[PDB]
């Protein structure tokens, strides 16, 4: 009852064995210590470019679905983002049921006498409200 | 919960152009 | 599972428990009845393990060479099925990309014509 | 490299007066949902 | 009709692309690092008997396992007392 | 041994449901809800 | 013939396993473990102990994981306190039940 | 502090200071708890090293019968020692021989368990791969049926309109 180690069956430990077989790390443990307290880049280093196709697809789908406003010859949709409008001083914006981001461009002016600073963000904040109103 | 007020003062564009 | 290791560990644990009970009783009634029941259960488990290792459980002969060949054939069949599924998935992805392109074209045409 | 330089204009500053004409036509909608 | 068809086809294609990416990643992992199971099983059998690698079958209150390899390697071995 | 039948098998560990949620003395569970719908769009990077 | 086939196992595995153990975690920000420029790079350039070329003596884990994730100057900054390391060790100690609920 | 000053600083440099390609670790070393030398058993067989009692069969029933015979011999020796005289020490020798035989049987069982464990792991992997292939085939068939139904609906709508 004190030296029966020679009669003890062999421990298998299938999980730990399969983990240590090829994964030379500590995956079978809590790995949220250095992750939850650090802003590491998980994925989409340069592969995010491939998501632009799906982004443009979703943008076109939402455009087709939602009743578009008057043309104004300024409507456009391409990669990267969706050019909202460019007629006159209209700015462009797009996202990144579904969210809707903004602040990609700004207003334009002429006949200088420099132009107004970035205090326009106020309206942008209201735009944010219009982004969350979803009417 | 960002803000529960009405703000217009924060801009406060100064002059600093006293002649 | 159903491997020899399970029955081997069971028999080893039963033998260890029987040895511990014998050591406890040798240096010492519900206790006598409990010890007799434990010994009978251990003997029955050992007899069943011996019968399984004789008839059911595979002995040292009949190695896993045929089992390894069957596993390799199954892995090759699964790889072929995965390759066919990947080809079908590429076909479907191309079809979906073309459909999305056509839908976007139709939408842009309807927008510009309105 | 530019976080203190506030370019003042004060010529077209009238825009701020026009600023108090949008919330009156349509005000923003409070959310209280910082998703 | 086209939107419904595109949504169904996109869901199916996303599921199939996920499955294909999983299969390709498994194939790449198998092709990158792969060795015979004989040596792995031998090392597992040689290190799983005693409480050298991790918690053995003899688990009791207060498991002597730790985040490090072991405690006997540094108390008397030459791994934690290479210079002393 | 000494030239026994070898098999060049593939190393495929188990990846069904690992221990993701931190547990406290047993009675634990998984935390992977397979949010592939949201994870499709989760790279909130800078526009410009 | 010491740099070729005599240092890859004498001072490569032993020193890494000694400097990467959680016992001397707070006892390494003084002599240089990951904060030095020529320390983390030299550790990463000597990670040939857990790759597919040394899969015959895989007994000491956490060999390359330390140089991969810990020595990346991210985990070395924080987690050096007494309360944080103790909490991490307590949270990792509870993961020692991989043989009971492995079904 | 307590750390290597000469060795740790001599190899902390660029160029040849880094580790070379990992060759076959088949010589003297100190990796972990072993000498980094494979094909080295930890215990001997039943017919070499100690007295030969267990046969080459190494069957579970044969091992149980051998253990029972050893226990009976130990009990007879203990009874003879307690009854006649304590000048007999064959009991401890028989117990040590039985322990060594049990250790050899356990080592043989653990050596044979690797092939069975590998075969079980391969069978489980084959079953998992077959289930995954069946699920993927079902998904592909559902996708093809959805595409066929979409085409049929498009043909029916544009014709009747």
Q: Which of these, C105, C96, E1, lies nearest to H155 by C-alpha position? A: E1
- Which residue among H42, H142, H150 places its CB closest to the CB of E5? H150
Rounded CA-CA distance C68/A73 in Å is 69
Q: Which residues of C37-49 are buried (b: 16+ CB within 10 A; e: fewer)?
A: eebeebeebbeeb
Paired tokens of E66: 């730790």
Beta-carbon contacts of E36 under 8 Å, excluding residues fewer than 6 positions away, are F6, F7, F8
How far apart are the C-alpha atoms of G38 and G31, rounded to whole Å?
Answer: 12
Record the resolution, in angstroms: 4.8
Chains in contact with D, where contact means 3 or more Cβ–Cβ distances below 8 Å, are A, B
Is the CB of A24 less than 8 angstroms away from the CB of G92?
A: no
Give residues after which chain D gaps, C-N over 2.5 angstroms.
none
Minimal Cα–Cα distance from B11 to chain A, Å? 7
Q: Are G42 and G67 in contact (CB under 8 A)?
A: no
User: B5: left (phi > 0), else alpha (psi -120 to 50), else beta?
Assistant: beta
Alpha helices in chain C (DSSP H): 4-26, 30-51, 65-113
Structure tokens at F21: 């949620």
CA F37 to chain CA centroid, nearest Å: 18
Residue with tokens 């707070």: G26
Report yes or no: G11 and G32 within 8 Å, Cβ to Cβ.
no
Residues of A with CB under 8 A from a CB of C: 1, 4, 7-10, 12, 53, 56-57, 60-61, 63-64, 68, 71, 75, 77
F6 at G interface, C-beta within 8 A: no
Dihedral over Cα of F43, A30, E80, A23: its sign: negative
Q: How far apart are the CA of A126 and the nearest CA of chain B, in angstroms?
A: 13
Contact by Cβ (8 Å): H106, C51: no
CB neighbour class for H141 (10 Å; exposed up to 12, middle 13-18, buried from 19): exposed
Residue whose token pair is 């909490």 = G87
Angle at F23 between CA F19 and CA F27, to 5 degrees: 95
| Nearest CB partner across the interface for F22, out of G91, G100, G101 | G91
- G58 to chain F, closest Cα gap in Å: 15
d(CA C11, CA C52): 12
> Which among G21, G23, G40, G24 has a CA at the least distance from the CA of G32?
G40
CA–CA separation, H81 vs F25, rounded Å?
A: 51
Q: Do the Cβ atoms of A7 and H113 come within 8 Å?
A: no
- The secondary structure of G42-84, three-state, reads HHHCCCCCCCCCCCCCCCCCCHHHHHHHHHHCCCCCCCCCHHH
Contact E34, F11 (CB under 8 A): yes
What HEC string does A28-63 produce?
CCCCCHHHHCCCCCCCCCCHHHHHHHHHHHHHHHHH
Residue E7's contacts (CB-CB under 8 Å, 6 or more residues apart) are: none
Do the beta carbons of residue E13 and residue C96 sit within 8 Å?
A: yes
Name every residue whose Cβ is closer than 8 Å to that of residue D7 and which is 6 or more positions away in sequence.
A114, A117
For residues H8 and C106, give the distance between their C-alpha atoms in angstroms, rounded to a whole number. Answer: 69
Task: Supply the Cα-derived Rg of chain A in whole angstroms.
Answer: 28
CA–CA distance from F16 to each of C52, D17, F20, G15 (Å)? 33, 62, 12, 36
- What is the 3-state composition of chain A as percent helix, strand, coil, each rounded to the nearest 5? 35, 0, 65
H89 touches chain C (CB under 8 A): no
C56 in A contact zone (CB under 8 Å): no
Counting Cβ atoms within 10 Å, is residue H18 exposed (0-12), middle (13-18) or buried (19+)?
middle
Beta carbons of C83 and E19 less than 8 angstroms apart: no
- Give contacts of E6 with chain C, Cβ < 8 Å: 96, 99-100, 103
Q: What is the DSSP string of C13-35?
A: HHHHHHHHHHHHHHT--HHHHHH
CA separation for the pair A30, A18 (Å, rounded): 18
Answer whether E82 touches G (CB < 8 Å): yes
The answer for residues whose C-beta is within 8 angstroms of residue A8's C-beta and 6 or more apart is: C12, C16, E49, E57, E58, H106
How many Å lie between the alpha carbon of D25 and the closest alpha carbon of chain B? 16
Q: Which of E10, E1, C96 is nearest to H152 (CA)?
A: E1
| H60–C75 CB contact, under 8 Å | no
Q: Are C4 and C14 in contact (CB under 8 A)?
A: no
Q: How far is H106 from chain F (nearest CA, A)?
A: 18
Choose the mutation target among H63, H70, H107, H126 for the interface with C, i.e. most C CBs under 10 Å.
H126
| CA F3-F5-F8 angle, 5° bins | 110
Chains E and A touch (3+ CB pairs under 8 A): yes
DSSP 3-state percent helix, strand, coil across chain H (nearest 5): 60, 0, 40
Cα of A23 vs its chain's centroid, Å: 30
Interface of H with C in 15-74 (CB under 8 A): 57-61, 64, 67
Cα H161 to Cα G74: distance, rounded to the nearest angstrom: 64
**CA-CA distance, A44 to A25, in Å (whole number)?**
22
Is G101 close to F22, i.e. CB distance below 8 A?
A: no
User: Which position has the token pair 């199916």?
Assistant: E12
Supply H63's token pair.
Answer: 């091992």
CA distance H39 to A1: 32
The vertex-H120 CA angle with E31 and H67, nearest 5°, equals: 135
Query: In which residue are the tokens 């029916």 written?
Result: H156
């Amino acid at each position: 009852r004190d030296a029966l180690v020679h009669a003890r069956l062999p421990s298998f430990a299938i999980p730990y064995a399969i983990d240590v077989l090829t994964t030379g790390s500590y995956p079978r443990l809590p790995t949220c210590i250095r992750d939850k307290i650090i802003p590491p880049d998980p994925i989409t280093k340069i592969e995010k470019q491939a998501t632009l196709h799906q982004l443009n697809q979703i943008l076109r789908h939402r455009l087709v679905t939602t009743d578009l406003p008057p043309q104004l010859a300024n409507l456009t949709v391409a990669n990267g983002r969706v050019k909202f409008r460019v007629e006159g001083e209209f700015e462009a914006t797009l996202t990144v049921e579904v969210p809707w981001r903004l602040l990609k461009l700004e207003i334009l002016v002429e006949d200088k006498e420099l132009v107004h600073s970035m205090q326009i963000d106020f309206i942008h904040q209201l735009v944010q409200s219009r982004l969350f109103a979803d009417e | 919960p960002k803000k529960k007020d009405v703000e217009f003062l924060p801009p406060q564009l100064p002059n600093d152009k006293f002649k | 599972m159903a491997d020899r290791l399970t029955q081997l560990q069971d028999a080893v644990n039963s033998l260890a428990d029987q040895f511990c009970n014998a050591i406890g009783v040798l240096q010492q009634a519900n206790p006598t009845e409990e010890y007799a029941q434990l010994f009978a259960a251990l003997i029955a488990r050992t007899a069943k393990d011996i019968d399984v290792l004789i008839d059911s459980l595979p002995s040292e002969e009949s190695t896993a060479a045929l089992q390894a060949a069957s596993l390799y054939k199954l892995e090759e069949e699964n790889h072929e099925a995965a390759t066919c599924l990947e080809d079908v998935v590429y076909r479907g992805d191309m079809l979906l990309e073309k459909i999305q392109s056509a839908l976007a074209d139709i939408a842009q045409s309807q927008l510009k014509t309105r | 490299k530019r976080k203190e330089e506030p370019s003042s204009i004060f010529q077209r500053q009238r825009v701020d007066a026009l600023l108090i004409d949008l919330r009156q036509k349509f005000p923003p909608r409070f959310v209280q949902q910082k998703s | 009709q086209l939107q419904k068809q595109l949504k169904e086809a996109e869901q199916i294609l996303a599921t199939a692309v996920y499955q294909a990416k999983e299969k390709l990643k498994s194939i790449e992992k198998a092709r990158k690092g792969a060795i015979s199971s004989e040596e792995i099983i031998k090392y597992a059998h040689r290190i799983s008997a005693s409480n050298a690698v991790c918690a053995p079958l003899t688990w009791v209150p207060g498991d002597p396992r730790r985040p490090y390899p072991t405690d006997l390697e540094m108390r008397s071995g030459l791994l934690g007392q290479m210079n002393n | 041994m000494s030239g026994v039948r070898a098999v060049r098998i593939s190393i495929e560990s188990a990846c069904e449901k690992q221990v993701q949620e931190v547990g406290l003395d047993g009675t634990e569970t998984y935390l992977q809800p397979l949010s592939m719908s949201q994870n499709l769009a989760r790279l909130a990077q800078r526009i410009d | 013939d010491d740099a070729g086939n005599r240092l890859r196992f004498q001072l490569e595995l032993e020193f890494v396993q000694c400097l990467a153990n959680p016992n001397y975690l707070n006892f390494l920000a003084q002599r240089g473990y990951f904060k030095d420029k020529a320390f983390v790079n030299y550790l990463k350039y000597l990670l040939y102990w857990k790759e597919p070329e040394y899969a015959k003596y895989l007994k000491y884990p956490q060999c390359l994981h330390m140089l991969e994730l810990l020595q990346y100057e991210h985990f070395r900054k924080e987690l050096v306190n007494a309360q944080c390391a103790k909490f991490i060790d307590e949270q990792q100690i509870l993961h020692w039940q991989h043989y009971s609920r492995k079904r | 502090m307590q750390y290597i000053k000469e060795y740790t600083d001599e190899n902390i440099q660029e160029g040849l200071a880094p580790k070379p390609p990992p060759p076959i670790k088949d010589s003297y070393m100190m990796f972990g708890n072993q000498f980094q030398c494979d094909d080295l058993i930890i215990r001997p067989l039943e017919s070499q090293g100690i007295e030969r009692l267990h046969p080459m069969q190494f069957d579970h029933k044969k091992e149980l019968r051998k253990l029972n015979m050893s226990i009976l011999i130990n009990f007879l020796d203990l009874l003879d020692i307690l009854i006649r005289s304590p000048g007999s020490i064959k009991r401890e020798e028989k117990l040590e021989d039985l322990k060594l035989l049990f250790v050899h049987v356990h080592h043989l069982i653990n050596e044979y368990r690797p092939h069975q464990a590998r075969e079980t792991l391969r069978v489980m992997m084959e079953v998992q791969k077959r289930q995954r292939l069946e699920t993927a085939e079902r998904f592909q068939k559902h996708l093809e049926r959805v595409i066929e139904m979409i085409q049929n609906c498009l043909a029916s709508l544009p014709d009747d309109l």
